[PDB]
Symmetry: C4
């Protein structure tokens, strides 16, 4: 049982079969967005979907029989598992949010094609070093979202009315998005000195980012 | 036998000759953007344009005989062929869009000047290195684009009603252009949790951009 | 007395205890954001503040005795002093900015954690080589803030009414924030040549920044 | 006697005297922005301004006598001569824009301190290596500005009606400033395929700039 399977799963037909299906699922998945296509030829796709989800599910079980415990020490394999799991509950009508996360199964093309798997991997490896600067900036953000809710949330509740809202606005400013004519200049109509909160915030927030990148470059 | 033409063309005089026609036409084409000038100089420049396309056409024909199979495997010359081809498509044969693409021919100044070529050659050379990333990025856009249409299209048809539109909106968010007050904030009036899609989207797409750029540096 | 006091403050138990308090007071400050909660539990936390600021007050007092004159040559410790001291000025005195400046004590997580201390010094470390670039820019900004105020402050007071105002708008244009549809297209309606001011300005300002970034890498 | 003066100009008292002066005139021109100041002390500052303009004209006369033809191959002095000349043309009888140009002499602070001069030369020095890329791109803009005037200048004159207008708008898109909700979405209400034009453009202009920064950094 273990032995007949092992020769199937590692073959250039098993992975090729699965990979071809991903590209197919992904083209049909574009089509599922058209309400035109749905009326005449979409009953076709809902079941096509269910064949692939079964085909992937069987594939995963086999790979877990073959690789056993070493399956769940593979981040790429773990991804495939969790991506195919949540992608298994039928549309049902219990809820709608779970239905749209399903498209994430096109990210299997990344797990299974080697050129792509390494860039992603190369990219992730930049992150562990940055995890200090991220934490720092979040604490920095945190100290500042608190300053902002209390300072501006009474006259500008949409922007700063809530800790959450304050973070959101604070993120926006960092990306420099309609930040002045759009947020600070109004803020300044009530609170003329709001510029003492946001220009420092901007220098700092931008300084750290540039240096986060320099440290990326050098490292 | 008929070397002599082959001799004729390669002349140092000849080459800067076709360059001088480019620079003159490039100037005259700017002038054609002015309403004043074309009325009282139009036939002079509608004529001057017809001459140049012909000489360029004969120039293209001659160069083929000398190089044979090699001509159509020269990147700079293939370009040369087609932007010349465009002006040979009839002016009243379809829409007037082809009349506008004629001005793509001023780029021959890029193909005809080695320092131009050198930058262009250098720049493109960056690209094969990035073919893996572009594939990744385009896959990522494609995936997040589908989710948008099924998540936001019916209440926001202009921005998300459709894949191409969703693509577009997502491309816009990636240029960080008015993304929050202009798109995501409205979205949040009806779909309060929209910050969960668009902010991760921002983090990821900004991230890949930043890091890839480093790669051009190290390489 | 001397060595016993010197021995608990330097202890690993003390600072962990203090840190835990920093982490607690910070979560608590996040809690004062839901005004449902604050009207329902705020008295517990307004004095919770006071005893937290008490313990921190003690630690500050001991460390000065323990390090004597060597305390006040330490930038990180000085900061702690000041960031706490501020919080000792009465919440009903001066004005209500002081109440908000109290949140900066949360920057002690950086002070009291050496991994954080690691990051910051590195960052701070890049500034001295930049001072020279910083100086030139500010003089540049200052001249143009003068030029802009005399030119546009009359018909456009919000933006250029005052040197301080032109300073703000120019920083805004620098961040490249809604600089065209939002500021200079309107200027150009009265002063059609306004582009001769802002576009050169942007070339310079954008140019210096890049090279500044380049300078950082090399430095 | 002999060139008694020649000894003095070099003297590290003469230069320091001018720098102290510029900074005074720089301080003066600032206060000239206060509408209130120009009442209370407006007469005092014109006096101060006229002496300085004279002293500087004198300082320029001496320096040319000493350096002769070598004065007019020093860019810094050439800049100084034309910057001093400007502040001397009559305040009336014509173009009062020139009344504003005379603030450019504040750029003398740079002129007389050999650090800023050093930085500026350092800065200027990266431009020739870039000059190539400036030419391709300018060529690219010129060609696309032409394309945009012919395609969108009819129904959208404010933005693209004139070549200069297409340049200005196109520069803006490049600066990525409010480009979708602000330019391309409107166009697209009339011309649905306008994204096939601007989106590649956006790719190209952004691709080039990033590789440009890279070329600066490695060397
Ligand atoms: C040239 C005078 O600028 C200042 O003194 C200001 C300071 C001095 O603080 C310097 C800290 N950056 N804070 C900053 C930052 C301001 C500014 O406008 O620049 C962005 C102001 C300002 C002054 C007068 C009228 C309005 C304003 Cl808003
Ligand atoms: Ca913006
Ligand atoms: Ca904007």
């Amino acid at each position: 049982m273990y032995l007949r399977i092992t020769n199937i799963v590692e073959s250039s037909f098993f992975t090729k079969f699965i990979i071809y299906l991903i590209v197919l699922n992904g083209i049909t998945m574009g089509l599922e967005t058209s309400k035109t296509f749905m009326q005449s030829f979409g009953v076709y796709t809902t079941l096509f979907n269910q064949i692939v989800i079964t085909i992937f599910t069987i594939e995963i079980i086999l790979r877990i029989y073959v690789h056993r415990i070493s399956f769940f020490k593979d981040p790429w394999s773990l991804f495939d598992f969790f991506v195919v799991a949540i992608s298994l509950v039928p549309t049902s009508s219990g809820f709608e949010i779970l239905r749209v996360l399903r498209v994430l199964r096109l990210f299997r093309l990344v797990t299974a094609v080697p050129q792509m798997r390494k860039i992603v991997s190369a990219l992730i490896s930049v992150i562990p070093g940055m995890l200090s600067v991220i934490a720092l900036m979040t604490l920095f953000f945190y100290i500042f979202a608190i300053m902002a809710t209390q300072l501006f949330g009474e006259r500008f509740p949409e922007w700063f009315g809530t800790l959450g809202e304050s973070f959101y606005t604070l993120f926006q400013v960092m990306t420099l998005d309609d930040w002045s004519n759009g947020i600070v200049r109004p803020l300044m109509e009530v609170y003329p000195y709001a510029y003492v909160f946001f220009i420092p915030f901007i220098f700092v927030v931008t300084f750290v980012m540039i240096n986060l990148v320099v440290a990326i470059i050098v490292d």
